[PDB]
Ligand binder design. Structure first.
Ligand code: ACO
Length: 316
């Protein structure tokens, strides 16, 4: 997960846990009259880097397994990425995020219960989809950290360039790498990927038909937020994929936002061997309990942060 070469005294430690794999309804609407409907299994991943008693950064990633008879459609969605900045940075954040995200993408030791003692065996063929949105904000995970002396805030274009560099380095050889900047002319979007030969403009999802049957609705995703609206306004039987992305450009979040962007990469027909890797797994309630504790900590305050960390260590 993390290499000793970056740093290795014992100075830094990690928080890392997953939820127990949990069946959910598909984040992509599957028509009721469709054969070979897949089962969907979701796993939440939370990672934080600690230095001494302080949190340095955090990363939340959701993995969705669409399990078919002969293959898995595996979506990896970056939920949140954030830094604290209480101390002078001794390491480049991007060089921790990359490896952790790559580990999460490639993780295949999930203990999945049978669909209604005995765990389900997944198909060996997986098709990977990596989905990342870029949107600057003062804070995503760590309340009040924007006030901190060493928190570095990237503007939207800097943030996009940062994510492109990270994602490119961990998707080497993947079948595609897609960038969309809703509302931006294609020349402006092209400029971000001119030095990335394997990247092109657009998105990774099905191009035709209804948007709701092509695009996954991920939690707390600018794309998902519009999808939700389409569904509650019952425009879901009408709006195509192309029209969805056209109208997405005019959403307040995009049109008033700072280079809000959407990245998707795919790797097709990867043969995966199930590998047992023992990590801390928790119930959803335990996971949510942790996240709720998190949102109540003042991350501008060393005392509160150290206490949070102390309290976690005594737990497990
Ligand atoms: C919606 C989404 O999923 S995207 C959301 C992204 N997350 C956020 O916006 C949360 C708020 N923002 C942040 O927490 C940060 O700005 C992050 C996480 C985006 C990046 O943190 P950084 O510390 O900037 O990462 P990193 O350590 O790699 O620094 C990256 C660049 O900024 C420079 N930098 C880092 N710290 C500093 C600093 N204190 N002062 C000046 N420059 C700095 C690095 O040298 C590097 O510059 P280079 O491009 O010349 O190498």
């Amino acid at each position: 997960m993390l290499p000793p070469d970056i740093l290795q005294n014992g100075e830094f430690e990690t928080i890392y846990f997953q939820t127990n794999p949990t069946y959910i309804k598909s984040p992509i609407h599957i028509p009721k009259s469709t054969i070979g409907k897949p089962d969907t299994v979701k796993i939440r991943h939370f990672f934080a880097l600690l230095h001494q008693d302080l949190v340095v950064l955090g990363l939340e990633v959701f993995v969705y397994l669409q399990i078919y008879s002969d293959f898995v459609e595996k979506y990896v969605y970056v939920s949140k990425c954030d830094t604290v900045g209480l101390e002078k940075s001794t390491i480049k954040i991007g060089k921790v995020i990359g490896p952790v995200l790559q580990y999460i993408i490639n993780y295949n030791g999930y203990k999945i219960k049978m669909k209604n003692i005995e765990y389900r065996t997944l198909p060996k063929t997986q098709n990977l989809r990596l989905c990342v949105f870029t949107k600057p904000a003062k804070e995503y995970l760590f309340p009040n950290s924007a006030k901190n002396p060493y928190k570095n805030l990237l503007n939207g274009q800097s943030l996009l360039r940062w994510w492109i560099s990270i994602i490119d380095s961990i998707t080497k050889g993947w079948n595609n790498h897609k960038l969309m900047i809703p509302g931006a002319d294609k020349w402006a979007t092209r400029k971000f990927i001119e030095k990335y030969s394997d990247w092109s403009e657009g998105h990774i999802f099905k191009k035709d038909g209804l948007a709701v049957q092509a695009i996954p609705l991920f939690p707390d995703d600018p794309k998902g937020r519009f999808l939700e609206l389409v569904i509650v306004e019952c425009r879901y039987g009408k709006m195509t994929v192309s029209r969805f992305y056209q109208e997405l450009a005019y959403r307040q979040e995009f049109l008033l936002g700072d280079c809000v962007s959407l990245i998707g990469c795919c790797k097709e027909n990867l043969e995966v061997t199930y590998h047992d890797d023992l990590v801390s797994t928790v119930t959803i309630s335990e996971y949510k309990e942790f996240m709720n504790l998190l949102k109540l900590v003042d991350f501008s305050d060393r005392v509160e942060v150290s206490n949070f960390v102390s309290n976690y260590r005594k737990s497990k």
